[PDB]
Design a protein around this nucleic acid. Structure first.
Lengths: 102, 51, 60, 225, 415, 136, 121, 27
RNA sequence: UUGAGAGAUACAAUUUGGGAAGAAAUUCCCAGAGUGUGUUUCUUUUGCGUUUAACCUGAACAGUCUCAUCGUGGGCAUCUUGCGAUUC
């Protein structure tokens, strides 16, 4: 949700390596037969290959992320375009006032 | 905007009408401005409150 | 035809002509830009070899 | 006193006592930086071709300026609201500008004008790591570059390969001294448009904006794929 | 083994190898331009033209441990290029603290410092040590003894790791050795009569060899135990082996190989021994050893074709008479060529395209006409060798063997 | 020092009038516009109204091309030219005030103290060179 | 101090302080931070020299903020004591502005040093 | 296309003549 | 006479395109490109370019004392008639 603690926590884990508790939740909710994963950033190598997940992020993963980032709001959530921009700017102002002190 | 002003401006900062009339005719400018009501300038007495 | 062959050669080879206030440049080809490194800057190559053939060292 | 429109809606020319360029408002009532405000019932902020850089390209004549009132735009180099205010005015309340900068000394006034306009969302991270704001927004319709760093082509190439949809616009402002001084603007600008069409940016136009800036250019291109 | 040709108005001023242990060899080279060019050794083409983001490159050097690359440019910049991303991918890293004059030569101390000789007669020392407080700023500046009646340029700079010195040759002919810490001269030799273009050292830095436009190779030795405990080079020896200049010198030293290699304006190579320079022997290579030919004849019409850079020429025996030539300037670079038996069609071919020309002897001249084939115009050719009067076999630069005028099955090799 | 203050504030008045007068004008652009095209015929042709769309009115001045009033003959034109002349004479007043304050400041600097000599150039433009001696 | 951007090396700081000494002899510099900011406001400064040696450096790093508005070059030298020696007073000097002139004898030296400054910006 | 091109030319002249100059441009 | 190469700059016709008038012939407005005839700008190019030079600097104004500033008187009106600047 719009909880500032969870938002800024995943924001710090996105601006750093991506081994957050939500990524541990993803490792819980995708453990079927040590499946293949497409990470976004190559610097998240720890949660990319930590435990039973064949990860791949190179030079076409960016193309499929272009596709799924082009059409995040139209089918993935039950949300709308102004709602995605509002939650993005809430997260943005939170992380901005966190890094830039006041 | 107050921080990027020189210390002479911070001296005369309240007394703009006296300052600019005393510059636009060639007279003597004020020396106190808004800073006259500081306690240290209250402790001083004479011409050394200008100082 | 002897006194203008280089003229018609260069005026048919060269690009980026003027159109009033404007200038219509050609973009180059991925063919040449991926088969070869770009040409040397003749200014600096002439500076280096003109230095090594300066008059103060008496070559012969 | 008579406002005529421009080639791009959200950009107008207020003719009359001073035939000068102008944009709309999304800030109701007030200026942001002491730019002049013209009312014609309806409020308007004067753009300056000297105080800002995109206005100089408009005044020099940019036909397919991909900043346009039905889009969303990514601004890599403002540092303060003095240009992205006018970009939020021209893009209107339908879209969104992502003003992304690194030096957090004028990022204070960047966030301060982003408080007033919901059009403007700020990013306070350096534009050579777009992965650090992967999780904020993607798929912009036009990037803008005003970075005065030497790796302009690589920085906006990374930002356009991560966040620019196909066949969109690229507008890059190139300062000649931040790449190579002592050699003229013609060679350094030809070198940079070749460096940018090394990526999937078909160059469309460059112009030199000479009465407003010394040795600058604005290059527009379309992102191929 | 191989030759990688460049075309019209292309030159090459510096080149450096890079071999991280376990990965392929990588070969970068500057020309007279604003880019670095990395070549893949398979095809013989550039696989990367990284435009360095400041000015015209004057020198190139490779880091020790070979993850970074210095390019020293005409506008006084020293630009670091991140190399360790894999073969082919090059990133910009950091422009070091600028200056006025162009930096003409570079060297690294280790991963830490970068030394650069400039065209104002000075030798700067920058720190390329990342995550220090003084990263990128120039720590020291040293000034060599200027010429009286012309400007002085420091042409060659090396670091000597066994001691802690910088050796430097400049355009007065003087060769100076500088203590790195304290950034200051230990001793200067007045060795050559004109500029010292290139100088190098052996493994344990008991010798420093040096050469330039006055065409002698000087050897500075520190092999005595007293020399090593006193840090005192002596001007040991001096040899005259080259004809015009020496523009490049390098040294290799292993268990069964210890030779310094040198070449210059005269086009030949010269091999000398490292630890036995003055005593031992030397070998001046031939100026060309045609492992790739530029001339072939055809017995009919008694004629011979020969191609230099981007032009072919044909003459007949009789005396002899130049019957035709093709200075094709739509071309930029040439490579191998073959004629049909009966002397009908010539085919010229470079690694980017190839082109086939019908020929008709019209008497004391020929008539030459292009015959269009876009498969030939698109293919890369190394070798064309004419099965028949019409059929040729084509070896492509990407290991394809066509038969035109189509595909030979070719098995794979154990890597 | 107080008539130097008078000339300096007059100069600052004209400086601010200059900058916030030139902020509210519009200057005709003069930039080398360049257009990139395909193989050779697009360069050989006229760039056929690719952004002009009239070759009479909306081609050759670029402050606003297009894609399709109180005496507009000479009154607005003379008002425009007169505001440009106002900014130009603000500039002339500001540079004359800068020069006269510079001479006043040189005279004031000259009559303070320290050792100095009258240095004369080729022309007769005199200057005063001060002795290398720091202030006690 | 880390937050004192461009800092000069030894050769550039030696020629900066040489042109400061001859401008002090020609009475062409304003020594002190308030006089430097006054010349910044009035637009009669050629370039600003500051000292990366003051124990609050924030009493300095505000005139960068109006140097980058009037695109006037500015530079840091490591010693306020040495800057005061160069300016030719008996006190340490924190900042110094070399004022503008067009008939100046040392105009070429001022221009050379300010070009060497704006190379490192 | 007469009623479109003629009216477009008339509207373009009636706009562009009211911000332009002939002898004041060099001034 | 830069030996050669490239840019602006006058004259002439020949033209390329967007609009408006006409039956077309063609006209009219506008914006342009190119070739011949003059000036001129930039890069090699040789006798040699000057092979030294320029500038700064050391205790470098001042006994016929030098300089500054405020005044006083006088000359120059057959004109240094004098600028918040030295006219002698």
């Amino acid at each position: 949700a719009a909880n500032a603690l969870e938002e800024a926590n995943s924001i710090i884990e996105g601006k750093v390596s991506s081994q957050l508790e939500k990524l541990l939740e993803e490792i819980k909710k995708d453990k079927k037969s040590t499946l293949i994963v497409s990470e976004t950033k190559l610097a998240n190598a720890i949660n990319k290959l930590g435990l039973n997940f064949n990860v791949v992020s190179d030079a076409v993963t960016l193309d499929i992320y272009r596709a799924i980032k082009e059409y995040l709001p139209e089918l993935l959530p039950g949300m709308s375009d102004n709602d995605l921009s509002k939650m993005s700017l809430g997260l943005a102002h939170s992380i901005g006032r966190h890094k830039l002190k006041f | 905007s107050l921080a990027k002003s020189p210390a002479s401006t911070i001296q005369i900062l309240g007394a703009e009408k006296a300052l600019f009339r005393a510059l636009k005719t060639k007279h003597d400018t004020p020396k106190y401005g808004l800073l006259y009501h500081a306690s240290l300038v209250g402790q001083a007495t004479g011409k050394n409150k200008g100082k | 035809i002897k006194t203008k062959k280089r003229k018609t050669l260069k005026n048919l080879r060269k690009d980026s002509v003027k159109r009033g206030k404007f200038r219509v440049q050609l973009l180059s080809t991925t063919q040449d830009s991926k088969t070869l490194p770009p040409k040397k800057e003749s200014s600096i190559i002439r500076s280096k070899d003109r230095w090594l053939n300066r008059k103060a060292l008496n070559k012969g | 006193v008579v406002i005529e429109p421009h080639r791009h809606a959200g950009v107008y020319i207020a003719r009359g006592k001073e035939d000068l360029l102008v944009t709309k408002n999304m800030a109701p009532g007030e200026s942001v930086y002491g730019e002049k405000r013209i009312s014609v019932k309806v409020e308007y902020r004067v753009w300056n071709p000297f105080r800002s850089k995109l206005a100089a390209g408009i005044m020099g004549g940019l036909d397919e300026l991909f900043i346009a009132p039905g889009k969303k735009v990514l601004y890599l180099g403002a540092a303060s609201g003095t240009s992205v205010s006018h970009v939020s005015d021209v893009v209107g309340p339908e879209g969104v500008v992502y003003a992304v900068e690194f030096s957090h000394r004028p990022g204070r006034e960047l966030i301060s004008m982003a408080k007033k306009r919901p059009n403007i969302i700020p990013i306070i991270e350096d534009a050579r790591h777009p992965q650090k704001y992967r999780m904020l927004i993607g798929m912009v319709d036009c990037v803008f570059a005003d970075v005065a760093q030497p790796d302009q082509a690589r920085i906006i190439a990374l930002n356009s390969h991560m966040f620019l949809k196909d066949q969109g616009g690229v507008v890059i402002s190139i300062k000649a001294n931040c790449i190579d001084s002592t050699v003229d603007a013609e060679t350094v600008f030809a070198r940079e448009v070749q460096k940018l069409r090394e990526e999937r940016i078909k160059p469309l136009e460059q112009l030199t904006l000479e009465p407003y800036e010394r040795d600058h250019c604005i290059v527009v291109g379309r992102y191929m794929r | 083994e191989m030759v990688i040709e460049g075309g019209k108005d292309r030159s090459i001023e510096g080149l450096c190898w890079s071999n991280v242990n376990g990965e392929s060899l990588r070969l970068f080279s500057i020309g007279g331009s604003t880019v670095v060019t990395e070549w893949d050794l398979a095809t013989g083409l550039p696989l990367r033209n990284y435009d360095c983001n400041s000015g015209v490159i004057w020198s190139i050097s490779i880091n020790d441990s070979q993850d970074k690359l210095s390019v020293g440019c005409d506008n006084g910049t020293v630009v670091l290029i991140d190399i360790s991303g894999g073969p082919g991918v090059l990133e910009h890293d950091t422009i070091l603290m600028r200056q006025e004059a162009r930096v003409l030569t570079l060297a690294w101390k280790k991963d830490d410092f970068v030394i650069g000789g400039c065209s104002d007669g000075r030798i700067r020392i920058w720190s390329a040590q990342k995550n220090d407080e003084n990263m990128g700023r120039l720590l020291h500046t040293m000034k060599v003894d200027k010429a009286k009646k012309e400007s002085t340029l420091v042409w060659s700079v090396i670091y000597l790791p066994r001691t802690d010195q910088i050796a430097s040759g400049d355009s007065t002919g003087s060769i100076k050795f500088w203590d790195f810490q304290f950034a200051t001269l230990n001793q200067s030799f007045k060795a050559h009569d004109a500029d010292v273009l290139c100088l190098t050292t052996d493994t344990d830095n008991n010798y420093v060899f040096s050469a330039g436009v006055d065409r002698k190779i000087f050897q500075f030795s520190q092999n005595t135990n007293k020399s090593q405990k006193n840090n005192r080079w002596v001007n040991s020896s001096n040899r005259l082996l080259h004809g015009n200049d020496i523009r490049a010198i390098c040294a290799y030293q292993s268990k069964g190989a210890d030779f310094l290699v040198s070449g210059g304006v005269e086009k030949t190579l010269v091999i000398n021994s490292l630890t036995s320079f003055s005593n031992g022997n030397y070998r001046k290579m031939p100026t060309v050893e045609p492992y790739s030919k530029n001339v072939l004849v055809n017995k009919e019409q008694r004629l011979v074709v020969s191609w230099s850079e981007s032009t072919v020429k044909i003459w007949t025996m009789g005396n002899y008479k130049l019957v035709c030539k093709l200075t094709l300037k739509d071309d930029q670079n040439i490579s191998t060529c073959s004629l049909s038996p009966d002397g009908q069609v010539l085919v010229v071919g470079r690694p980017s395209t190839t082109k086939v020309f019908h020929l008709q002897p019209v008497g004391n001249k020929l008539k030459v006409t292009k015959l269009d084939n876009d498969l030939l115009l698109r293919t890369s050719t190394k070798l064309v060798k004419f099965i028949d009067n019409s059929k040729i076999v084509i070896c492509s630069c990407e290991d394809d063997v066509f038969i035109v005028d189509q595909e030979v099955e070719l098995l794979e090799v154990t890597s | 020092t107080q008539d130097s203050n008078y000339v300096r504030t007059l100069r600052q008045i004209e400086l601010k009038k200059l900058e916030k007068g030139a902020k509210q004008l519009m200057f005709k652009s003069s930039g080398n516009h360049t257009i990139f095209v395909d193989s050779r015929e697009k360069m050989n042709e006229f760039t056929p109204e690719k952004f002009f769309n009239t070759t009479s009115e909306m081609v050759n001045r670029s402050e606003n091309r297009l894609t399709k009033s109180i005496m507009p003959k000479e009154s607005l034109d003379k008002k425009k030219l007169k505001k440009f002349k106002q900014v130009k004479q603000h500039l002339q007043r500001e540079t004359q005030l800068k020069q006269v304050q510079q001479r006043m400041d040189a005279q004031r600097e000259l009559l303070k103290k320290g050792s100095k000599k009258k240095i004369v150039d080729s022309s007769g433009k005199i200057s005063f060179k001060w002795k290398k001696q720091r202030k006690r | 101090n880390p937050k004192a951007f461009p800092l000069a090396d030894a050769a550039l700081t030696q020629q900066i302080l040489d042109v400061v000494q001859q401008a002090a002899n020609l009475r062409q510099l304003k020594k002190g931070a308030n006089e430097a900011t006054k010349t910044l406001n009035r637009g009669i400064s050629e370039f600003i020299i500051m000292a990366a040696d003051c124990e609050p450096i924030e009493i300095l790093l505000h005139l960068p903020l109006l140097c980058e508005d009037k695109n006037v070059p500015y530079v840091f030298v490591p010693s306020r004591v040495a800057l005061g020696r160069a300016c030719g007073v008996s006190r340490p000097v924190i900042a110094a502005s070399i004022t503008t002139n067009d008939a100046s004898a040392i105009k070429t030296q001022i221009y050379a040093v300010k070009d060497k400054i704006e190379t490192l910006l | 296309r007469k009623y479109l091109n003629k009216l477009i030319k008339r509207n373009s002249q009636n706009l562009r003549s009211w911000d332009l100059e002939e002898e004041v441009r060099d001034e």
